[PDB]
Write a protein that binds this ligand. Structure first.
Ligand SMILES: Nc1ncnc2c1ncn2[C@@H]1O[C@H](COP(=O)(O)OP(=O)(O)O)[C@@H](O)[C@H]1O
Ligand code: BEF
Ligand SMILES: [Mg+2]
Length: 799
């Protein structure tokens, strides 16, 4: 699949070595190649070419540091390949370089291929590989850029990466979950691959930490800058444009704040100091960014503008803020949003050159803060904040919030300029803020739920989790890992012996959290993909409903209207999403009337539509669907059955179950984990007193003191029975009852418990046979074993 380049055999031969050597000499007479080499010789890395190659040749692991844009990503790979070609051994090269994101892997590969007077892929020297998309280069003497997630998937097919001669772990400052796992796997692989060469590269790095981690491996610094970059703090921004607005470290900030303002009045005008005093540290001043953008386009020379915002809500707000002005309405400006949830085609448009009289303005998240080179970028506006997930060990609650940027992220955002020409960087934090920023972000493995971490360790068969944790550079706490083990058992991704179930194997192959992975997996298995992908897309990210001030009464009445009789916050999103798609088919003006009428965000809805395509791609690579279309008729035979959908929701939401108590009109809700809870007023089941079932499933909790259920749907006890935990038959002599996880009790014939035990087992056999060669369930086949098992589960859910 995505392992076509890996499963080749590194077979060097002298005949190809001679062809590559002759091809290099013919390139040296090609005008397009010669002009590219003229630019390459100007890079700081070109002076270090002999030193870098000689050091990588004499040591197995090498740490390379250098200023942003000095040439690490695009030149080091070429230095290794061209050195082998000139030595008559070019075919022995199989260089793989990792990039943290798909936009980095694609654009860098296109750039390197262009620097070598070649097209990307097509059996040339350079190509790329990402999820379900690749331009593969030739077999021998080639360079392949790819995402770190591709290498992790490669380890499932070849844990030794046998055909790879050089692996380059690039942008290692992005200490994400997958990068830390891959780095620890490579370290263990060194002794088993004495012929392998490993290179570690970043611009903002505690290099000594990485060298010591890799057995005191040698370090090499690439000195020099490509182009200067002017840096501006908040005081410098307000002074230049004359802008007037129309936990313990904060105690240090408040303590030094009055003296800082006094020292600031001696270096800046009193008006700007007053503006600095009333600036808000809670959120990014989008009015200030827009005023700075206006100053750049009206007073400064030509050059694209790149803006860094924490999330999607900030990007769309600033975009509407600029588009509401006459100046940015015209075609002299092209405003391009950039979000990770966008299709890859939309992300690449940022690299397209603009007409000479047209100014490009890119509004991006941290997706654009590393690696990528945008040609015309001269001005970088750093909002100073970045979305970060945070996890508390005491209570199972994870929060996404806009946090102050670290010094490393700021240097990477500043690094997006000064690559092809001089630049300017404006940081929206004051000097006192700068002195209190951390050097680096906390590694994601130290501040997020670790269910994906544990699934990743188990799928690679790296031995016990305890041993692998001790080998990580920054190991998480054992209490956080045990909580993940408990959650994975309740999801039935791990059995009682902490071993992967068949379901857990497929969840480990899905690059999302297992709760979402389990929901989208059974949506494909039960042929209700489109409504389930919509629900999953809204559980991640956010729901499309908005509530203006004073409009709470009318907005609630709209939501209860869209819910019909489903008693389901998640089926309400489906109906709101479907009604939105039907309004788009009507027209653009009537689509806006629909969103305003029901208080729906067209921006959020469009983002949910993009997430649905990304979820379908994950299931496509996993082999559970046959196309990238979330509305493919193959996977939507049961998409208009409310009961099957609600079961798939329950499949993903368990064990987040709530029990309803009615008193003859009072309704009380209990969740076992936190006891009594209430229903959040935004939900559709707030004033509900008539329930067909006494059980709810939820996804989001809020406290807010007394626990509130953000989104909940009523669910049948037979959905909790099948997708639940342990099943026990309780005998009261007077009568028998069935229990799920002891507390979920309901009157039911005891033989149903035996049926569920047998149907769960057949589901495991179905998923087991899907492991070796995944194939979507052919629901057209009435007399098939896979459909018979799934039909029996469906009949149990319906009755
Ligand atoms: N798409 C491109 N168009 C023009 N120049 C580019 C492009 N990509 C890279 N470059 C030039 O090549 C240099 C090397 O970039 P890169 O190797 O990514 O630097 P680093 O790895 O040190 O961040 C950049 O400074 C830039 O000037
Ligand atoms: F160091 Be480069 F900007 F990736
Ligand atoms: Mg780089």
């Amino acid at each position: 699949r995505d392992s076509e380049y890996l499963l080749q055999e590194n077979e060097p031969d002298a005949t190809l070595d001679q062809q590559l050597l002759e091809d290099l000499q013919k390139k040296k007479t090609d005008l397009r190649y010669i002009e590219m080499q003229r630019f390459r010789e100007k890079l700081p890395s070109y002076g270090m070419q002999k030193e870098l190659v000689n050091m990588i040749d004499n040591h197995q692991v090498t740490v390379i540091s250098g200023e942003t844009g000095c040439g690490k990503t695009t030149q080091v790979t070429q230095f290794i390949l061209d050195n082998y070609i000139e030595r008559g051994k070019g075919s022995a090269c199989r260089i793989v370089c990792t990039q943290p994101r798909r936009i980095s892997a694609i654009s860098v590969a296109e750039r390197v291929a262009a620097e070598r007077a070649e097209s990307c892929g097509n059996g040339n020297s350079t190509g790329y590989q990402i999820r379900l998309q690749s331009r593969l280069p030739r077999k021998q003497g080639s360079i392949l850029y790819c995402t770190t997630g591709i290498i992790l998937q490669w380890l499932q097919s070849d844990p030794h990466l046998s055909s790879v001669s050089h692996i380059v772990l690039d942008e290692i400052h992005e200490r994400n979950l997958q990068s830390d796992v891959l780095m620890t796997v490579v370290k263990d692989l060194l002794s088993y691959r004495p012929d392998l060469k490993v290179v570690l590269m970043s611009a903002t790095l505690n290099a000594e930490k990485f060298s010591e981690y890799f057995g005191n491996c040698p370090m090499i610094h690439i000195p020099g800058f490509t182009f200067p970059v002017v840096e501006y703090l908040l005081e410098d921004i307000i002074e230049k444009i004359r802008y007037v607005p129309e936990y313990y470290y904060e105690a240090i900030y408040k303590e030094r704040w009055p003296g800082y303002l006094r020292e600031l009045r001696q270096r800046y005008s009193a008006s700007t100091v007053d503006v600095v005093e009333m600036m808000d540290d809670e959120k990014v001043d989008l009015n200030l960014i827009a005023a700075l953008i206006r100053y750049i386009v009206l007073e400064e020379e030509d050059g694209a503008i790149l803006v860094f915002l924490p999330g999607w809500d900030n990007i769309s707000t600033l975009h509407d803020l600029l588009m509401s002005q006459v100046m940015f309405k015209s075609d002299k400006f092209i405003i391009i949003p950039l979000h990770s949830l966008m299709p890859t085609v939309n992300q690449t448009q940022v690299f397209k050159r603009t007409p000479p009289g047209v100014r490009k303005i890119v509004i991006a998240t941290n997706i654009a803060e590393t690696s990528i080179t945008i040609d015309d970028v001269v001005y970088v506006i750093d909002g100073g904040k970045i979305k970060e997930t945070h996890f508390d060990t005491q209570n199972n609650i994870s929060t996404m919030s806009a946090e102050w940027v670290s010094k490393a992220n700021a240097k990477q955002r500043k690094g997006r300029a000064g690559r092809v020409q001089p630049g300017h960087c404006y940081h929206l934090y004051n000097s006192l803020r700068a002195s209190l920023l951390d050097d680096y972000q906390l590694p994601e493995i130290l501040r997020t739920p670790l269910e994906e971490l544990c699934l990743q360790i188990k799928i690679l068969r790296l031995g016990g989790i305890a041993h692998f944790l001790s080998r990580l550079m920054d190991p998480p706490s054992n209490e956080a890992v045990l909580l993940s083990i408990k959650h994975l058992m309740e999801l039935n991704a791990l059995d009682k012996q902490e071993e992967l179930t068949p379901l857990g194997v497929h969840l480990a192959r899905l690059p999302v959290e297992p709760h979402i992975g389990k929901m989208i997996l059974f949506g494909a298995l039960f042929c209700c993909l489109d409504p389930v992908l919509t629900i999953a897309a809204s559980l991640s990210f956010k729901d499309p409903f908005v509530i203006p001030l004073g409009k709470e009464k009318v907005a609630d009445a709209r939501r209860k209207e869209l819910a019909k009789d489903t008693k389901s916050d998640h089926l309400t999103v489906v109906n709101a999403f479907k009604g939105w798609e039907k309004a788009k088919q009507r027209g653009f003006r009537y689509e806006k009337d629909y969103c305003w009428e029901y208080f729906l965000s067209s921006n959020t809805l469009q983002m949910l539509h993009n997430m649905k395509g990304q979820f379908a791609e994950h299931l496509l690579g996993a082999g559970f669907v046959s196309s990238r279309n979330p509305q493919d008729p193959e996977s939507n035979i049961n998409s208009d059955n409310e009961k099957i959908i609600k079961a798939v929701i329950c499949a993903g939401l368990y064990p987040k179950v709530a029990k309803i108590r009615l008193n003859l009109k009072m309704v009380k809700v209990y969740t076992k984990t936190d006891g009594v809870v209430a229903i959040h007023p935004k939900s559709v089941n707030v004033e509900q007193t008539e329930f067909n079932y006494n059980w709810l499933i939820y996804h989001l909790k809020m406290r807010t003191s007394s626990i509130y259920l953000y989104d909940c749907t009523e669910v049948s006890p037979y959905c909790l029975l099948f997708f639940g935990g342990d099943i026990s038959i309780q005998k009261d002599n007077d009568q028998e009852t069935i229990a799920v996880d002891e507390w979920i009790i309901f009157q039911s014939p005891a033989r149903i418990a035996h049926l569920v035990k047998e149907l769960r087992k057949e589901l495991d056999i179905l998923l087991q046979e899907k492991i070796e060669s995944p194939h979507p369930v052919d629901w057209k086949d009435t007399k098939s074993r896979d459909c018979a098992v799934l039909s029996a589960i469906i009949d149990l859910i319906k009755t």
